[PDB]
Amino acid sequence: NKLTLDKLDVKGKRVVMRVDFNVPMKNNQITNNQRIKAAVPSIKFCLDNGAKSVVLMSHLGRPDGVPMPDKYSLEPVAVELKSLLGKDVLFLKDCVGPEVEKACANPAAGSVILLENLRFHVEEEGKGKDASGNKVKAEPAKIEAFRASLSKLGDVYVNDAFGTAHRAHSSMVGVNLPQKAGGFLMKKELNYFAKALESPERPFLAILGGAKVADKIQLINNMLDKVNEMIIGGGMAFTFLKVLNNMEIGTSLFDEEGAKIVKDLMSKAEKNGVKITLPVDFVTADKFDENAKTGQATVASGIPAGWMGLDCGPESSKKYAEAVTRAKQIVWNGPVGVFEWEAFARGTKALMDEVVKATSRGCITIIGKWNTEDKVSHVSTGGGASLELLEGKVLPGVDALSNI
Ligand SMILES: Cc1nc2cc(-c3ccc(Br)cc3)nn2c(C)c1CCC(=O)O
Fold first, then answer.
1. How many whole angstroms separate alpha carbon 289 and alpha carbon 282?
2. I need a labelling partner for 184 at 20 to 30 A (CA). Which of 131, 147, 292, 304 fits?
3. Which positions does UniProt annotate for AMP binding?
4. Is the CB of 233 under 6 A from ligand 1?
């Protein structure tokens, strides 16, 4: 029970809101505006309930504590947000200090202000790199001044930046105001994850894909305490199948360090009564390339020398659909093939099709140009944060919110 924005009285108040506007950019303009979109409901709520101002703060990229306004400025985000809000956004070329404080001290009623990239200061992350690429540490008195300056910019604080909530950064745990509320995005992410983690509908299926095994050990370990079924798919599966079945895997991804714990994970699954589904067939490629020659293989055939599996095949898609069919709650993290490449996308799109059907019949479905909004219960906006939650860790940014 943390304070949320809907329970905060903002009438006549300056709202300082941490958002996640760390959007994809191409040299350098906005390629996907979904994170910006995702914040509008909190922003409008504030303006609709009489807030005097909304001061928005975020990072963009990894400028590493160096001001990089030619490369990583938030300026284009002000223009995009104006389009999406239907309201003027003032952009400020810094995020702390006397001119910014004065600008945010008493804005005209209803003013939306977006500050420049917080990570242009080393005090946000607390560590950074210099102009030469060497590591620098922030000084405590400077971190204190930075956090104090941010704290002046609002009367109340909102954190809607679930994508950054795993970082104990100044804008996340250092704002000292009497009320610190989660935004509606934050609320939605924590509710889908708390529900799922602590009181799952059943059966609860975890679908885990991605490339490396060793970086998902704790994820799998924690999820085996919560779930009833688990598909281990995608690039990870080859390490499992090599160890458990002595499968011939070609040049498929193999994690030497993960391989040591495969059997340990399968034991924990056997100990908690979790039914594990691995793939049984593959689309193969002659090299790691979008237009590689393709082939087909099974666990029993092996993958031929020099070839790699980049997708599951049709029999796997069936077994995966059977598990999705049985589930009343699904959490999916990581794809089941190289879905950016059409030839290796069928498995992922097929599994998505199933998850969308499941949603239609009341399955709670969580995925860690498309209106994906209508089709699944929840698409998470934060990769690393949602992983850290799935691994069973506390998020500093959530823990810092006010209780009530
Ligand atoms: C960057 C990268 N990402 C992925 C992802 C996948 C991948 C993902 C799914 C499946 Br099924 C099979 C392979 N392979 N892969 C490789 C070989 C690379 C490059 C080399 C490596 O990091 O091992």
1. 16
2. 147
3. 211-212, 216, 235, 309, 340
4. no
- 72 bridge partner residues: none
C-alpha angle 400-3-18 in degrees, rounded to nearest 5? 55
**Cα distance between residue 278 and residue 273, in whole Å:** 16
Is 306 among the annotated ligand-binding positions? no
Question: Ligand 1 centroid to 356 CA: how many Å?
Answer: 26
Mutate to test the pocket of ligand 1, among 253, 286, 338 (most ligand atoms within 8 A of CB): 253
Experimental method: X-ray
Quote the CA–CA distance of 393 and 31 in Å, as a whole number: 31
- Would residue 293 be called left, alpha or beta, if left means φ above 0 and alpha means ψ between -120 and 50 degrees? beta
Q: Show the domains of the chain with their CATH numbers.
A: 1-185 (3.40.50.1260), 192-391 (3.40.50.1260)
Three-state secondary structure call for residue 390? helix
Per the structure block, which two tokens stand in for 226? 């919560």
302 CA distance to ligand 1 centroid (A)?
18
Distance 253 CA to ligand 1 centre (A): 6
Q: Residue 73 has which token pair?
A: 């400025």
Q: Which two tokens stand for residue 119?
A: 């990570």
Q: How far, in Å, from the CA of 335 to the mean position of ligand 1?
A: 11
Are 136 and 65 spatial neighbours (Cβ–Cβ below 8 Å)? yes
- DSSP conformational letter for 305: T
Tokens of 165: 């909530």
